[PDB]
Amino acid sequence: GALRELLEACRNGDVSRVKRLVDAANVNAKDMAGRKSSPLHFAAGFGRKDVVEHLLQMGANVHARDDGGLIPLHNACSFGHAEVVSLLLCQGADPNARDNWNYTPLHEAAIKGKIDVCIVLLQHGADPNIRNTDGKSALDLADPSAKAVLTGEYKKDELLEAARSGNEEKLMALLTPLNVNCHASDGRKSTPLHLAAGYNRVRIVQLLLQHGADVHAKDKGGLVPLHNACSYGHYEVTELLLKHGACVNAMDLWQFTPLHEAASKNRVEVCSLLLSHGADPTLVNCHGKSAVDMAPTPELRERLTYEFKGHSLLQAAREADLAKVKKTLALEIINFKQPQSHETALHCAVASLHPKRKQVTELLLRKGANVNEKNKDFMTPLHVAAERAHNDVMEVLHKHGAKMNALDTLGQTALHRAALAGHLQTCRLLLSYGSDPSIISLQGFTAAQMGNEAVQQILSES
């Protein structure tokens, strides 16, 4: 009776009448003749945002099936109600729902040429590749207009221009997970990420990287986003690309690494950064020229070499590569520190899991390392070794005269750190070597007071 009154109000968008008529008892009522549709089904299909809002507040089922297997989202998609589509997606209707023929809402909008619905669905993770019972995908049944969207090639000039002009909202208007690694038709044949990286669109890069942009995508001449960023000296975006797995020695068709690009254009600070991420300045290109060759400044030539040995040593030290350490060894490089962490090669050696780490520590000290060098939070190598219970190297550090009671940022000794981690044999040895237990930290704790029962046992014999 009065169910028919509601379903008619839902088509017209008479919000007042839907308010009056609808309640929990009938909000999900099926039209028992014809399509077997819900009130939400009708409202959604007719583009009634306000009726849809109120229906959803009254507990309208967004996964309700009609007789054909459709979902209110199917209905809104067929008739291009991108406002109502966005609203149903937000309540959790999945954009890859299957009707009885396995048409998804993306089939329904691609068939009907609905571009705004297509992009909204793809942004919410719709699948172009789901096939119906006749084996046909959304792209196969697509309208000639909507076919351009489902190949990731739509307003692609406008998408690319937004990326290089730094236009956040006009990018996110067009950006599907498909048009994110598109290439330009001509010129350099760059991707969105290439351009954003080249033109220093730090925010556009974050959005592209989030939405699946390819950090490895090559342009016409072999380059990758990192080449563009380094050439023009964008530290912000260079660091961001590296963070997301960019290959630091990636090579184009002429075998230029990013460090070649940076060094030739005297980007002192990007070179510094790249070297710390494992860049190799001795790598030659097609024209037999290294990064050191292409550096114009004589300061950059020596700094590229100094910083390279430095890192190359630190790395050898941490994978305890004893042979590698014996090679890369002058006094200038021994005490080389890591720009950020302030970690000398000795800190890296005593923290190595690898089996030759005692011998690397020994050699580095024989070759004249600073046994009490502090790292960024004032920890000596003894602290680093002691908090890991790398006890073998503590013999070596002690022999070369490490201060056992060197204090860190919080006034804690090595013993405090060991006691805290529960390292029982470390504690024992640290005392044998001479760590005073009675030292109070800046917070009022002895090593004993930080440790478990077993640690206290050991430390209360003094």
Binding site: R35, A44, G45, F46, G47, G80, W101
Partner: peptide, 12 residues
């Protein structure tokens, strides 16, 4: 059976 169009229509 065979596939039908869904309920609803385009706005203006």
């Amino acid at each position: 059976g065979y596939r039908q169009s869904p309920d609803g229509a385009c706005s203006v």
